[PDB]
């Protein structure tokens with residue numbers, strides 16, 4: 119299995135996931151200056167910009183590596199934000215719509 123086609127696939131998949139986050143609330147790290155209690159609750163922050171950096175640093179070499187960080191984006195947001203917020207429901211929506219993107223992309227990776 120070759121590295122370059124796999125990274126091309128992950129780049130495309132990341133772009134498709136970012137397209138689902140229409141408010142761009144997951145595009146960059148949660149601003150810790152605005153939420154000093156965030157790290158009291160969240161052990162490993164994650165966001166799409168950090169994922170892009172990890173991808174280009176060759177830190178994702180299987181689909182699980184990539185999907186685990188996506189799941190952190192979702193789970194951190196569900197954990198930190200109250201159920202009655204836009205942010206919480208945006209993580210639900212991203213889990214649902216992004217899971218579909220991920221299933222098709224993992225299938226492409228399995229074809230490699």
Ligand SMILES: CC(=O)c1c[nH]c2ccccc12
Nearest residue numbers: 143144148149153195198205
């Ligand atoms: C994705 C997320 O939880 C957040 C994204 N931006 C934020 C700002 C304040 C509190 C939380 C957030």
